[PDB]
Curated annotation (Swiss-Prot), chains A, B:
Non-receptor protein tyrosine kinase which is activated following engagement of many different classes of cellular receptors including immune response receptors, integrins and other adhesion receptors, receptor protein tyrosine kinases, G protein-coupled receptors as well as cytokine receptors. Participates in signaling pathways that control a diverse spectrum of biological activities including gene transcription, immune response, cell adhesion, cell cycle progression, apoptosis, migration, and transformation. This is Proto-oncogene tyrosine-protein kinase Src. Residues 1-57 form the SH3 domain. It comes from Gallus gallus (Chicken). The chain holds residues 84 to 140 of 533 of the full protein. The gene is SRC. It is found in: Cell membrane; Mitochondrion inner membrane; Endosome membrane; Nucleus. The phosphorylated form is termed pp60c-src. S-nitrosylation is important for activation of its kinase activity. Expressed to high levels, and with a high degree of kinase activity, in certain fully differentiated cells such as neurons, platelets and macrophages. Isoform 1 is widely expressed. Isoform 2 is expressed only in the muscle. Belongs to the protein kinase superfamily. Tyr protein kinase family. SRC subfamily. Forms a complex with polyoma virus middle T antigen. Interacts with AFAP-110. Interacts with GJA1 and PXN. Disulfide bonds: none annotated.
Length: 57, 57
């Protein structure tokens, strides 16, 4: 299964991928799962987490 | 809806969130969607992309 970029995206960090509209991309299986933007009720910090690391309460 | 960390995770960049096992986290709605690890067929580069930016071929 192959995706196609609908928009350009410029990498903002050392871990994201830049692409131009029309580029073809393949998703890569990773242990961590999809990454979610999350807010910590425990610490008040906010940022991306690996979804396979968490569970519904 | 509130998640709970199953494991500790140490932030590796300026955008991820550290947490300890047992911490409580809330997912945050973002424009970008979940982030996926992707491999570019166009450039051969690899890294995380915002999923709302791409579509099935």
């Amino acid at each position: 299964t192959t995706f196609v970029a609908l928009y350009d995206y410029e990498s903002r960090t050392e871990t994201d991928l830049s692409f131009k509209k029309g580029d073809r991309l393949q998703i890569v299986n990773n242990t961590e799962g999809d990454w979610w933007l999350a807010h910590s009720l425990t610490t008040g910090q906010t940022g991306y987490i690996p979804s396979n690391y968490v569970a519904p309460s």
